[PDB]
Structure formats: C-alpha cells, structure tokens
C-alpha cells in the first residue's frame, strides 16, 4: 500500500484529507506540531495511520518522515494571517522554510509528487470585484501571503531543476467541521456557527456586503486526492474557488435559518486589512479536476451545524 506524508495533517483541512486517504486504502503519515492541529482530529485507531509530532521546518525530522513515503501533501503552515503580521520571523519558518526543507528532503528521497496549499492571499487586492484568474498580477500584503508565493516559486524551481511534480492549489475560503473557531481571526463561518450553536451574538465587521467564494472542506479534499493521483499535473497554479458569490449577509441569513434559532448581529468597524470582494475564476479548476456537484453553501453549513 502506498503511503502519503501529510504535513499539517492534524489540522482542519489535513485531518479530513487523512480520513479520506485511509478510506481509499492509503497508508498515511502525519507530521504536525499540534500548534493548532489536534490529535483528537485523527483516527488514531487506524492501523494505516502514523503520527509524528514535530516541526515541519526541522530537516532531521523531514529526513525521517519522508522515508517510505510515495507522495506528499504539504498543508503545514501558521494559517492565521494576523499571526504573521505580529511575528514575521517566527511564521516565516512555518510558512516558507518548511516548504524549502520539504523540497530538499523529497529530492534526496526521490519523491516527486507534492500537493501544496497555496492561498488567494497572493493576489492581494489585485482583481478585486472580478473573477480572479491565476495569471492576475501578484500582490502579497503580509508575510504569510509573501511566504505562500515564495513557496510557489521554490516549488517551481525544484520542478525544473530536480524533477519535482508540484500541484499548486490556491485555496479561497474553506469552511466546515473541525475548522477551529477559537481565534477572533478564525474563519468567519466557524466563528458565526459556533456563536449560533451557543445562542450568543455574532459580530459583523462592516456592512455585510463583502463577498467570498466559500468552499466546503469535503470538496477541497476531493481535489487534493485527485492532485495526488493525476498522471501529469500542470506546472502552474490552480485556484480552488467555486466562482461563487456569498455576501456575509447571505451567510448570516442562511446560518440563522439552519440553526432554527434567533441570531443577534452586533456591529464592529470594517477590518483594517479587509478585501471587500473575492471570487475565483474557476476555469482552470474545472478543466483540470473533476468537481462533480460541489456542496452549496446551505448544504455545507447544514453539515457543519449538525456536527456543532
């Protein structure tokens, strides 16, 4: 049985990927420092699962972790953009050095396929209010965003210089069960859903007209598995957004209806770094992957709410 190394596999997106890889018959090795990841997210009773707790920027750990692995999915990073604004030096280790060290370890081990979690943040404000195509000029505004873009550049260098096979995916806004809502900068759907379940007020920053291209985690996981299994993945990046439009106000009403309970909406000022309109151009994604019928917002919110 083939083995998949998944960095950041104990986190929100990773642990769902781990569940799906195991069900398909893969062996899975998780590398995670448990900074936001959780052992309780993993099916520790699965004989096909191994867990290494450590830093993904640690070259000695990566030299051990890649041995016996046939492919990689690189999800480890400090996901909070705001954390990179507060501490660019520390987060640069997790958000870029880990990518560089993984490229070194994969090339030494002879492993070619790596699926990489890049981010819509590399566009910055360029293309706002339009479907953002992948060749939109880049404008990373934070150390996180610049580190994701730098990661793409280095992955492409190892592709051309050393035969690596990167699958670069720029996630738009992912949501669903296990997304951690404990931070004021957690994803808005995890925060809003947690408050609605508890019967407590949510806070809306701005007028609510901001739009996001939300993707339910199970649809992203399908794309991640396809990235591991495709015979000759494209060299350049692929947006993972649906090209859908959801205002925060749409989200508030849909969530309130699903919860069956009243929802108080308090106000706060528009966030300083807030992009108003964000939407992916889905053409490369629809050409390169079989999306099937993705979950609608309502379907994804219901699955989230019913899990808590």
Ligand X SMILES: NC(=O)c1ccc[n+]([C@@H]2O[C@H](COP(=O)([O-])OP(=O)(O)OC[C@H]3O[C@@H](n4cnc5c(N)ncnc54)[C@H](O)[C@@H]3O)[C@@H](O)[C@H]2O)c1
- Find the shortest distance in angstroms from Cβ 192 to a second copy: 28
Q: Which does 35 bind (CB under 5 to 8 A by kind): a second copy, ligand X, ligand UD2, none?
A: ligand X
In the region spanning residues 118 to 147, those forming contacts with ligand UD2, defined by CB under 6 A, are 119-121
Asked if 22 touches ligand UD2 (CB under 6 A), the answer is: no
In the numeric block, which tokens belong to residue 212?
């996001």
Residue of the chain from 20, 51, 52, 85 that contacts a second copy (CB under 8 A)? 85
Asked if 101 touches a second copy (CB under 8 A), the answer is: yes
Asked if 174 touches ligand X (CB under 6 A), the answer is: yes
What is the spatial distance between Cα 184 and Cα 275, in angstroms, rounded to a whole number?
A: 17
The DSSP string of the chain is --EEEEETTTSHHHHHHHHHHHHTT-EEEEEE--SS--GGGS-TT-TTEEEEES-TT-HHHHHHHTTT-SEEEE--S---HHHHHH-HHHHHIIIIIHHHHHHHHHHHHT--EEEEEEEGGGGTTTTTTS-B-TTSPP---SHHHHHHHHHHHHHHHHHHHH--EEEEEEE-EEE-TT----STTS-HHHHHHHHHHHT--EEEESSS--EE-EEEHHHHHHHHHHHHH-SS--SS-EEE--S--EEHHHHHHHHHHHHTS---EEEEPPPTT--SB--B--HHHHHHS---SPPPHHHHHHHHHHH-
Q: By rule CB under 6 A, what count of residues binds ligand UD2? A: 20
Partners of 113 in the beta sheet? 165
Asked if 102 touches ligand X (CB under 6 A), the answer is: no
Asked if 157 touches a second copy (CB under 8 A), the answer is: yes
Asked if 33 touches ligand X (CB under 6 A), the answer is: yes
Q: Which does 78 bind (CB under 5 to 8 A by kind): ligand X, ligand UD2, a second copy, none?
A: ligand X
Asked if 37 touches ligand X (CB under 6 A), the answer is: yes
* Nearer residue to ligand UD2 within complex by CB, 71 or 254: 254
Residue of the chain from 81, 111, 225, 280 that contacts ligand UD2 (CB under 6 A)? 81
- Find the shortest distance in angstroms from Cβ 202 to a second copy: 28
Q: Give a three-class secondary structure readout of 249-292.
A: HHHHHHHHHHHCCCCCEEEECCCCCCCCECCECCHHHHHHCCCC
Q: Which does 227 bind (CB under 5 to 8 A by kind): ligand UD2, a second copy, ligand X, none?
A: none
Q: Which does 69 bind (CB under 5 to 8 A by kind): ligand UD2, ligand X, a second copy, none?
A: none
The residues of the shown chain that bind ligand X, judged by CB under 6 A, are 7-8, 10-14, 31-37, 55-57, 75-79, 94, 98, 117, 119, 171, 173-174, 180, 187
Interface ranges with a second copy (CB under 8 A): 85, 88-89, 92, 96, 100-101, 103-104, 135, 137-138, 140-143, 145-147, 149-150, 153-154, 157, 160-161
Name the residues that contact ligand UD2, by CB under 6 A: 81, 119-121, 173, 185-188, 191, 203-205, 210, 212, 248, 271, 274-275, 278
């Amino acid at each position: 049985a083939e083995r998949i190394l998944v960095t950041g596999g104990a986190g929100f997106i990773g642990s769902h990927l781990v569940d799906a890889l195991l069900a398909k018959g893969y062996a899975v090795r998780v590398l995670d420092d448990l900074s936001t990841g959780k052992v309780g997210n993993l099916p520790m009773g699965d004989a096909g699962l191994e867990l290494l707790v450590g830093d993904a920027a640690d070259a000695a750990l990566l030299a051990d972790a890649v041995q016996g692995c046939d492919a990689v999915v690189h999800l480890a990073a400090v996901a909070s953009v705001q954390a990179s604004v507060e501490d660019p030096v520390a987060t640069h280790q997790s958000n870029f050095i880990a990518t560089l060290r993984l490229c070194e370890a994969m090339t030494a081990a002879g492993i070619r396929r790596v699926v990489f979690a890049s981010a819509a943040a590399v566009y910055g404000n360029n293309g706002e209010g339009t479907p953002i195509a992948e060749d939109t000029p880049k404008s990373p505004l934070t150390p996180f965003a610049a580190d994701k873009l730098a990661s793409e550049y280095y992955l492409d260098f190892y592709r051309r210089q050393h035969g690596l096979e990167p699958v670069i995916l720029r996630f738009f806004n992912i949501f669903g069960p296990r997304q951690d809502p404990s931070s004021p900068y957690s994803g808005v759907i995890s925060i809003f859903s947690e408050r609605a379940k508890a019967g407590r007020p949510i806070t809306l920053f701005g007028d609510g007209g901001q739009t996001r291209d939300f993707v339910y985690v199970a649809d992203l996981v399908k794309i991640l598995v396809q990235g591991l299994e495709s015979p000759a993945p494209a060299a350049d990046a692929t947006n993972v957004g649906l090209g859908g439009v959801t205002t925060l106000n749409d989200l508030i009403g849909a969530l309130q209806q699903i919860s069956g309970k009243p929802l108080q909406v308090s106000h706060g000022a528009t966030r300083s770094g807030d992009i108003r309109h964000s939407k992916a151009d889905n053409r490369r994604l629809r050409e390169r992957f079989d999306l099937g019928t993705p979950s609608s917002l309502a379907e994804g919110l219901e699955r989230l709410y019913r899990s808590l």
